[model samples]
Target: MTTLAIDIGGTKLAAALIGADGQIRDRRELPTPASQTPEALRDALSALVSPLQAHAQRVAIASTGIIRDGSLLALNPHNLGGLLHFPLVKTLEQLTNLPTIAINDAQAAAWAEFQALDGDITDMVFITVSTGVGGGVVSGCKLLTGPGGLAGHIGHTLADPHGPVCGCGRTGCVEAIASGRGIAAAAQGELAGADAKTIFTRAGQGDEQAQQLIHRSARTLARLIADIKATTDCQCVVVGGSVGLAEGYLALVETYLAQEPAAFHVDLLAAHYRHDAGLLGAALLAQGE
Candidate 1:
């Protein structure tokens, strides 16, 4: 059987065609539209799939907005407008006439990692530390989606209630202190126009301010992981995203956790699929319920 996976991000769209053995036969990418109106974004996705529409049995979409079943549940306006409540699955099916499955981008990444593990381990926590922070969990090979399909929002959970304002309008959430954007915002004066990348680089070179911020963010993320571990007892915690993979960050998180009293010291590792976990996860869903 053949499956098509589409990963839609605010800045890029990626598609892949794969066979049952998980080998990709074809892959493509395109710049996503700046205008996020439903029609415009739909056209961009259509354009990416036009050539491959004829070769696949099912199409799976991993997108930025909240996805329930095959539709968009909500679009945080700070990232994209006119996306909330859009009929994405129906629209894509109409545009391509392909069987479809749709899910949140973070969930897609988590699924991809879970598939890569090949049942070697279950009960996984997958965290994507990127432009924004998001995560998902898999227990017994099934996603842990809570009511409102709002589970895996580890980023928005309170880290410090009195801290900086988050894009979600919450105060001192993990995203407010640990996301790529949040790191940049927090480093404004310390690194002088530094972004997340630059801050990590400077920290590697022994810059005190950059080093401090990096550890601060790492500690905050560790606290968040501790909370999840305390509640879920996940066996392995998989972390993706440039920020999480940044030099010294994961180590710091592990170190912090080692010092804390917890029921279990969950194994910390980067996701098995470096980049295409989202796409692969989407494709795997084609074979699921």
Candidate 2:
């Protein structure tokens, strides 16, 4: 049986018909709705998966926010706009008429990353430094979803008490100072209003300001990694997402992480499945993996 796997992120919605063997059979993508209305999202989702769902026997969703009681809730409401209260499983069930399951995108990704590890690791974490910083934790070789689906929502954890206000209504969250949005929002002078991609390009071209912004992100992430190591004692931490995998970004994080105390250092790896971690992980869950 095929599984219809959907990935909902801040910037895009993706759906794929994944075979029982976990191979992608059919795939489609759409820019996430700019309008952010529930109707807009519902319609967009329907359009994005309509053609592929007929070939699938069940549904799996990996989304960017908390998956609580089959509904979507946001730590950073700005990332999802009007979708703060969207009913994920029920909506998909209505749209596809198939049994549906949902999980936080980062949590799902961590499981997929965990499956791809090569060493004797009983604990791990997956961090996605994308539009917003997010993570998932696997302790004792099990993914933690928590009672309220808040186990691995590490983005909102305190990064600094006075740095910047986060979209989640907190002060100095890691997400506010370390994500793509954070990088872009920190742009100044000639870089004003530039997105993270432009900032990365400029940094590559020797723009010191751009370089500094990215360094701040990497340094912040390094600190967060240290915190994770202290908390989970995980054997490794896998990094993913657009910003996390950017050219030289992981190396920069490594450089900063090296400056920390010896006991805090842990192995860091780039995501083995890259951007498809969420989709494939969800499909694996749907198949009882």
Candidate 3:
């Protein structure tokens, strides 16, 4: 059977057709609508899947934000830009006329990463530091979505009381300091108003302020990793996303994580599935594999 898998992210919407053998084919992408209106998003999703749905037997979605009861809700409204609630499953079901399932993107990616790991590893966590910091935890080889589907949202955890306010209405969330947006937001002077990608380029060019901003994000992420270690005692942590996988970024995280006590340390690895984790994981889940 083929699964039509979709990944909804802050910046883009991705769709792919995956076979039961775990190979992806006909993958496509479209920029997420900036308007954030439900109609806009509905149209974007329609456009993304219309061409691929014909080859698939079922549909699966790995989407950003909290997915509860087949609906979408954002912890940070800014990420969705006024898309606070969306009937995800219903929309997809209507569009494809097939069975559909939706799960948080980070959670889906975590599952894919876990599956990619050696069989001996059962406890692990996945962290993605992109426009925002998001996480997923697998304990005893089971993904924990919780009763309300809010598990593994580590980014909202407090980082500092005096830090910038998060879109989720929290003060000093790990996301506020450690995400791509966070790094760009802290820019000053000549680097002010630059995006995270440009800031990273500046950092590579010996820009002191840019480098410091990146370091700050890395340090905060390291602290979050330490906290995850203490909380779940996971055997390993897998990191992904554009910023998380940036050159030298994971190494920086390793550097700060080493500063913590030995007990708080865990092996950190880059995401093996890279950007396709969510798409593959959702397909795997739909296939009951």
TM-score of each: 0.94, 0.92, 0.93
From the highest lDDT down, the ranking of the candidates is 3, 2, 1
Give the per-residue lDDT of model 2 (tens digit) for 68-167. Answer: 9998988766666778778889999999999999999999899889988875889999999988898999999888999878888888888899889988
Screening candidate 2 with a backbone cut-off below 3 angstroms (N, C-alpha, C), the clashing residue pairs are none
Which lDDT tens digits does candidate 3 get at residues 27-103? Answer: 99999997988889889999999999889899999988899898898886566655776888998999889899999
lDDT for each of the candidates?
Answer: 0.82, 0.90, 0.91
Instruction: Give the best candidate by TM-score.
Output: 1
Number of clashing residue pairs, candidate 1:
0
Superposing every Cα of model 1 onto the true structure, what RMSD results?
A: 1.7
The CA lDDT at 111 in model 2 is 87
RMSD of each: 1.7, 2.0, 1.9
| N/CA/C clash count, model 3 | 0
lDDT of 1 by residue, 152-227 (tens): 8889899997899988888898988988888888875647678889888888888888888778788888888889
